[PDB]
Amino acid sequence: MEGLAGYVYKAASEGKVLTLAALLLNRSESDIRYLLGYVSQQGGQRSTPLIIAARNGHAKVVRLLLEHYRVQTQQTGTVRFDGYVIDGATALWCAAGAGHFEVVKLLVSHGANVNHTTVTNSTPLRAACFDGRLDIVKYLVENNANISIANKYDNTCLMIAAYKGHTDVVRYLLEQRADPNAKAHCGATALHFAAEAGHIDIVKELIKWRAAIVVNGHGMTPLKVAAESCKADVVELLLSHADCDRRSRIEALELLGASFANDRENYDIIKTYHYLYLAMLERFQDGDNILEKEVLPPIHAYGNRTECRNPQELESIRQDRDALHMEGLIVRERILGADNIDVSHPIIYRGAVYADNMEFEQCIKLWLHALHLRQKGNRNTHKDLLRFAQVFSQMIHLNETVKAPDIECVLRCSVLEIEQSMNRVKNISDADVHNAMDNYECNLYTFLYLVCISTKTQCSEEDQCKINKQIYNLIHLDPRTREGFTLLHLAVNSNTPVDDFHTNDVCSFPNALVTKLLLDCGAEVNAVDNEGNSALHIIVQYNRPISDFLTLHSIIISLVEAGAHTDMTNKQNKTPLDKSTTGVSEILLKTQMKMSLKCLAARAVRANDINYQDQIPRTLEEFVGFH
């Protein structure tokens, strides 16, 4: 039976104890075990009735199921979602995650697995501390809890509890022989999670329990990441602890001052200037043992400035904010080394701030430096290219000139990122193949928007040649979307999703200029989709042939001139005339169609199914292939 089990699961989810008893009445032991312990797929969850009853917190339901019927403690199934789709979790894990003391107490008294390990070794203690119920954590503790059992990423309950803002649970774990020196999969400790959380009480309890501060696998000590996250309170605690020496504390002060000028949430130039006072004074208070910071060459994005080595230069910027933000970014790169992922969001946000008030000259170079850092860090950067396309379309719409070297550099980074995404999806796993393909298609679309912008702007012959070479590299690479669409097919398709922020105001697809430029760059005119539609099949189905007759006419002219079989057949044996919805496109193609005896003879050969293997040249062997 399936209906009775489904109704039992639904009643357990709803808490209908009378209905549950009615459904479970007059049932044998096998029937009792089948109705309680059957995995049902409801609401996106493959769960047993006991799992959904423990998750809902129904104490009466779970106690009836475990007392009168004695449901087994091996209720394994998929529970919850949003990064917590772990399968095989027992009812105790769900009860601890649900944050109901009565349910976990009843399950423990009934013999649930306290240290149960899931497919990702998710212990119930981790879920209990994630929910924040101290009583559940304790009740798990006295029932032979294993604090060594952690996630497969070496994430213990203490680390994830310190990540959240709950001091009571981390204090109870620390007094219950925790592991303050824990090391995660990335090398980060729970001290880093506490520092980025901004709760100084957790750090105080950790250092009271021999926290033993140390850098992570990447190389970011917790004081440094606390400084980067504008957590001044967390920074001003290790000085009281008195174990950060003098160079680490002063670079923490410098990074804190640099971060307050760039972080959007904690944007306050006053705090930046105050902590820069603190950094300068603590550097220049002794003289004999003066601590000096290194000098990096100036970066063209921030103008021409290398920190403020003389303090009087720092106090010379108390009347300005732009140079203060640039100095903060310079100091942030000097400390972080311009290699962590944390160096890109500040400069990107500064570029955005320069962009909202039409100061595009600084925004473009700031975002270009951020994009170069992202590319040199081997990080996904499709969003940065998308925002480049957006800002380029915005400044195009405002009738302001786009710098040709700027768009050339963006195109270079775009084709490099498309190569990176192509080789990433070449050997990607099934768990991430959909998102990898989505990123690849987003990179393709943003490349198309950039090419459309480059057609929109006016540049010299050298800049146009550079842009054409950058496009031709990708054209020779021959990128294909999940539907088999090449660059030409998307450039001639009206169904290409143009971004809604600013690109849709300028980049309109299909566009005659982008297709003409792609053909000049050597696009394969006779390409196919997965269903065989060439560029001509795609364009002839265009929805606005009257108002946009110029675009459709130019696309068809360019496609025919570059060489396109105007009677090529897709998998459904439909010529572009047979695929053309509008009569305007039909007659445009007929004007651009040249009668040929080779096509007529190939059509006759295909219709009569004459065997053309080795009887004709290979060129004809494919000519009848697509006719």
Partner: peptide, 10 residues
């Protein structure tokens, strides 16, 4: 404004 769209990855 461009500052609003940055909250996604950060």
């Amino acid at each position: 404004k461009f500052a609003d769209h940055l909250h996604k990855f950060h």
